[PDB]
């Protein structure tokens, strides 16, 4: 039974994710505040991303209890903890989007900027969570009390498509635009420097004063060509000789943990459109919604782990933070 596996697996799983996630994200928060001192824009969004994960993490103890026991915290706590879940969820992905845009603007193309964009982003994360705070309530579901969603059909179609737009389409569109643009800057023609004076031949500019059109490859220039500054030949020319990894991994790992759930709710909501309206398929999609939600819920403890492995400079700060 899916409910029996839930009551055995979730309480310890969610308690471990809560603990590991709380230590991990609370280390990031106080590393950024004390050591980095929130001077850069990337530090301001990583702080807000850590806060998003913490707002999500603090709900796990109540979900851990509800896996094995009924909902004993009442209707207000059901709505409060649903709000914190969604504010943490939307805040998390929106702060990953701003980090990917910040790297795009820095490569391809300031505290007041960070504070304004962060507070506006928290506002959109709070707004996106209102529907779930409205329709989620503590209700008698047969023999047991459950804190769950009671969306009218119209709202269920809205919730599902709006969750897939903000959680899957928007971040994937931002990734394809930002990283194709970032990759395009890393694709360039080779520039060569004169080993005598130091004149750098830039293929983009070329050398139109001595018969080289802008955009000519150094190898396509004739042997008679000479250095414009000192006059030496083509034979004396040598060829001219990190945050993206962390910010890229953070978005990729987000998709891995949350896309299965987003697609399962899309399939379970519009079953007639996908052709999954039969009896056997609805039961599998209900079990899949429960299984894929657990995967997504373990994501809130992963960003501090990515920083330790992908970030070498972050690794050094974690060792200093644990010592203090
Ligand atoms: C009140 O709603 C919350 C805020 O608003 C968004 C939805 C969210 N739903 C909550 C989040 C906690 C929740 C859960 O995590 N579930 C369901 C039951 C379940 N049963 C078996 C397995 C299994 F098999 F994989 F182990 C997994 C699961 C996953 C439950 C413990 C109370 C449902
Ligand atoms: C999310 C933020 C706040 C939710 C607060 C609780 C909403 C009102 C609950 C009323 C009730 O107890 O029936
Ligand atoms: C979680 C999926 C649903 C997302 C809802 C997005 C809609 C945001 C707009 C308004 C919601 C209410 C806030 C009004 C201020
Ligand atoms: C910085 C924190 C900002 C928090 C703003 C939270 C705004 C939304 C909170 C609560 C909505 C109240 C309605 C919930 C009760 C059910 C409503 C109903 O169906 O009658
Ligand atoms: C605030 C969000 C209001 C819009 C949601 C109403 C239900 C729409 C629908 O039937 O698709
Ligand atoms: C799985 C996700 C892939 C994340 C990208 C790979 C990690 C960054 C590269 C590196 O290890 O230096
Ligand atoms: C690498 C980034 C993407 C993350 C993985 C995405 C692939 C998994 C997506 C959806 C799995 C859906 C499984 C649901 C069961 C099939 C439907 C049915 O019950 O008939
Ligand atoms: C994604 C793009 C195209 C898929 C088209 C699938 C058509 C399904 C028809 C279902 C129906 O008629 O109920
Ligand atoms: C790291 C995460 C990679 C994602 C894997 C997708 C897992 C999908 C699980 C679907 C379970 C459906 C079911 O209930 O049988
Ligand atoms: C930190 C990475 C964590 C990765 C694991 C998290 C996701 C685990 C979720 C669910 C475990 C599978 C439960 C399957 C229930 C099957 C129901 C049934 O057939 O009766
Ligand atoms: C570790 C993998 C975590 C991701 C998904 C949980 C595994 C998928 C469900 C297990 C099979 C369920 C079944 O027996 O039908
Ligand atoms: Zn020269």
From Swiss-Prot:
Superkingdom classification of source: Eukaryota
Annotated effect of mutating residue 318 to L: No effect on expression at the cell surface, nor on CCL2 or CCL13 cytokine-mediated signaling pathway
Record key words, sorted: Cell membrane, Disease variant, Disulfide bond, G-protein coupled receptor, Glycoprotein, Host-virus interaction, Inflammatory response, Membrane, Phosphoprotein, Receptor, Sulfation, Transducer, Transmembrane, Transmembrane helix
Topological domain spans for side Cytoplasmic: 36-45
Topological domain spans for side Extracellular: 66-79, 136-163, 271-287
Tissue specificity: Expressed by monocytes and IL2-activated NK cells. Abundantly expressed on CD14+/CD16- monocytes and weakly on CD14+/CD16+ monocytes, type 2 dendritic cells (DCs) and plasmacytoid DCs (at protein level).
Positions of disulphide bridges: 78-147
Location(s), subcellular: Cell membrane
TM segment ranges: 8-35, 46-65, 80-101, 111-135, 164-183, 246-270, 288-311
Single GO molecular function: identical protein binding
Induction: Up-regulated by CREB3. In NK cells, induced by IL2.
Result for mutant: residue 98 to F: No effect on expression at the cell surface, nor on CCL2 or CCL13 cytokine-mediated signaling pathway; the nucleotide substitution creating this missense variant may lead to abnormally low levels of isoform A at the cell surface, while isoform B levels are similar to the wild-type protein
Post-translational modification: N-glycosylated.
Membrane topology: Multi-pass membrane protein
UniProt GO cellular component terms: cytoplasm; dendrite; external side of plasma membrane; fibrillar center; membrane; neuronal cell body; perikaryon; perinuclear region of cytoplasm
Outcome of swapping residue 298 to N: In PCLUD; likely pathogenic; loss of CCL2 or CCL13 cytokine-mediated signaling pathway; loss of expression at the cell surface; contrary to wild-type, does not rescue CCL2 cytokine-mediated calcium mobilization and cell migration, when transfected in CCR2-null monocytic THP-1 cells
Record PTM Phosphotyrosine, positions in chain: 104
Biological processes, Gene Ontology terms: blood vessel remodeling; calcium-mediated signaling; cell chemotaxis; cell surface receptor signaling pathway via JAK-STAT; cellular defense response; cellular homeostasis; chemokine-mediated signaling pathway; chemotaxis
Family: Belongs to the G-protein coupled receptor 1 family.
Subunit structure: Interacts with ARRB1. Interacts (via extracellular N-terminal region) with beta-defensin DEFB106A/DEFB106B; this interaction may preferentially require specific tyrosine sulfation on CCR2. Interacts with NUP85; the interaction is required for CCR2 clusters formation on the cell membrane and CCR2 signaling.
Function statement: Key functional receptor for CCL2 but can also bind CCL7, and CCL12. Also transduces signaling mediated by CCL13. Its binding with CCL2 on monocytes and macrophages mediates chemotaxis and migration induction through the activation of the PI3K cascade, the small G protein Rac and lamellipodium protrusion. Also acts as a receptor for the beta-defensin DEFB106A/DEFB106B. Regulates the expression of T-cell inflammatory cytokines and T-cell differentiation, promoting the differentiation of T-cells into T-helper 17 cells (Th17) during inflammation. (Microbial infection) Alternative coreceptor with CD4 for HIV-1 infection.
Disease involvement: Polycystic lung disease: An autosomal recessive disease characterized by pulmonary alveolar proteinosis, marked peribronchovascular and parenchymal lymphocytosis, peribronchiolar pulmonary fibrosis, progressive diffuse parenchymal lung cyst formation and enlargement, progressive obstructive airflow limitation, and recurrent secondary infections. Additional features may include digital clubbing, allergies, and atopic dermatitis.
Name used for this protein in its record: C-C chemokine receptor type 2
Originating gene: CCR2
Shown stretch of the complete protein: 36 to 321 of 374
């Amino acid at each position: 039974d899916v409910k029996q596996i839930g009551a055995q697996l979730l309480p310890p799983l969610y308690s471990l994710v809560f603990i590991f996630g709380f230590v991990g994200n609370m280390l990031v928060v106080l590393i950024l505040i004390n050591y980095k001192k929130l001077k850069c824009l990337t530090d301001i969004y990583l702080l807000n991303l850590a806060i998003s994960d913490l707002l999500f993490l603090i709900t796990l103890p109540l979900w851990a209890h509800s896996a094995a026991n009924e909902w004993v915290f009442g209707n207000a706590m059901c709505k409060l903890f649903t709000g914190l879940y969604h504010i943490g969820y939307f805040g998390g992905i929106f702060f990953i989007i701003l980090l990917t845009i910040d790297r795009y603007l820095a490569i391809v193309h300031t505290v007041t900027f960070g504070v304004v964009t962060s507070v506006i982003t928290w506002l959109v994360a709070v707004f996106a969570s209102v529907p779930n705070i409205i329709f989620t309530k503590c209700q008698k579901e047969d023999s047991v009390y459950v804190c769950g969603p009671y969306f009218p059909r119209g709202w269920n179609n809205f919730h599902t498509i709006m969750r897939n737009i903000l959680g899957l389409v928007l971040p994937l569109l931002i990734m394809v635009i930002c990283y194709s643009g970032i990759l395009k800057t890393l694709l360039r023609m080779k520039k060569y420097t004169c080993t005598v004076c130091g004149y750098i031949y830039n293929p983009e500019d070329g050398d139109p004063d001595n018969g080289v059109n802008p955009g000519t490859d150094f190898k396509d220039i004739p042997d008679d060509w000479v250095c414009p500054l000192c006059g030496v030949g083509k034979d004396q020319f040598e060829e001219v000789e990190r945050d993206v990894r962390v910010i890229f991994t953070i978005m990729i790992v987000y998709f891995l943990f949350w896309t299965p759930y987003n697609i399962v709710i899309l399939l379970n909501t519009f079953q007639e459109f996908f052709g999954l309206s039969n009896c056997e398929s609805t039961s599998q999609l209900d079990q899949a919604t429960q299984v894929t939600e657990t995967l997504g819920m373990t994501h809130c403890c992963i960003n501090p782990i990515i920083y330790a492995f992908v970030g070498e400079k972050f690794r050094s700060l974690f060792h200093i933070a644990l010592g203090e």
